[PDB]
Structure 1
């Protein structure tokens, strides 16, 4: 919704080669990202988007907060998929991006795609869940990596981040079978999100 800066975490993994979403999950993310950018822009023109990845041996800033849709897209061609995502750093890298923005009038928000069973420790990320809300960052976990037969670390994180605050975390679970990733996010709330001051 309005009055928001957005860090999109795109998951670069080899679990994004699963053709559970046609054709492949990575290429489904290519369409999805472009929409999410446009949607936030027409709601309120102070919304800008930055892009980070999981890619590398350590995640990386590919795009700083920018008003250009084409730089986000360009960032997607740049990043490789042999890389692999680790949650613990990806959360922290994103907060650093939220400290350098084009519009310091907006508020701080993360949207995170997960295509991977995250083998990172649950207990570790629970400390980081409590870091975000002190920095006044919310994270939305778009989850379809851990419905692949792993336990849900995510349930715990979403509850911990939630606190009376206008930035509110939201949990989406998406059906793994074919419906076209971009469609499932588009038809579900991405601008009907509401605050909890």
Structure 2
């Protein structure tokens, strides 16, 4: 792919531990965070990824942009397993992280695993929508948590963010069955995806 800066967002809600993916969803996530980091690098090696949590009851910046998985690993193992995803804070935090980098000629991406339905205000969601369009930030959300009993509030906004543009923003929906979580992300486009230009 192209030289890309990504914030990977990990949800540590209390639906992030559902038995849906073996063995537990939380162990499934350890394998996926590692898997995804790697997929991005092998595509084009000029990729970097930072790490922030969107949950724990608090969001926390673990890691800024790095080409070493050892830091990203280290931020992951320090977690507190209960939280609640604050959708709004993750988008903002991610956007500020993307303004400062070691390379400032890179694509601006946010990928977020969403393991719970959102409890966020409706008004709040509308503001971030145009914040992503101002700064020309495109976001793929991997959802397998907000389809379990919830309907996608997020859909409209993610659509809106897309423009003709080498990045395409996408809502990626994953059937939440047993086949393991890194595998469904792999069989979803996320480095098999095409542009909007």
TM band (smaller chain): over 0.9
Give 1:150 shift. Answer: 1.4
Q: Are 2:80 and 1:54 equivalent residues in the alignment? A: no
CA distance 1:42–1:4, shift in 2 (3 Å)? same
- The separation in 1 between residues aligned to 2:181 and 2:57, in whole angstroms, is 27
- The separation in 1 between residues aligned to 2:63 and 2:43, in whole angstroms, is 22
Say whether the 8 Å CA contact 1:139–1:169 is kept in structure 2: yes
Say whether the 8 Å CA contact 2:57–2:82 is kept in structure 1: no
Structure 2 residues not aligned, in runs of 5+: none
- The separation in 2 between residues aligned to 1:7 and 1:113, in whole angstroms, is 11
- The separation in 2 between residues aligned to 1:136 and 1:3, in whole angstroms, is 15
**Secondary structure in 2 aligned to 1:55?**
coil
Task: Kindly report which structure 2 residues correspond to 1:1-197, keeping only aligned pairs within 5 A, or say none.
Answer: 1-197=1-197
Say whether the 8 Å CA contact 1:7–1:52 is kept in structure 2: yes
Give 1:64 shift. Answer: 0.4
Give 1:100 shift. Answer: 2.0
Q: Deviations over 1:44-70 (max 9, x none)?
A: 221011111113443111110001011
**Secondary structure in 2 aligned to 1:184?**
helix
Give 1:14 shift. Answer: 0.5
Deviates more, 1:75-84 or 1:160-169: 160-169
TM-score (norm 2): 0.94
- The separation in 2 between residues aligned to 1:112 and 1:45, in whole angstroms, is 21
Say whether the 8 Å CA contact 1:126–1:156 is kept in structure 2: no
Deviates more, 1:123-132 or 1:160-169: 160-169
Give 1:196 shift. Answer: 2.3
Say whether the 8 Å CA contact 1:21–1:181 is kept in structure 2: yes
**Secondary structure in 2 aligned to 1:90?**
helix
Say whether the 8 Å CA contact 1:126–1:160 is kept in structure 2: no
Give 1:173 shift. Answer: 0.6
TM-score (norm 1): 0.94
Say whether the 8 Å CA contact 1:115–1:144 is kept in structure 2: yes
- The separation in 2 between residues aligned to 1:178 and 1:123, in whole angstroms, is 36
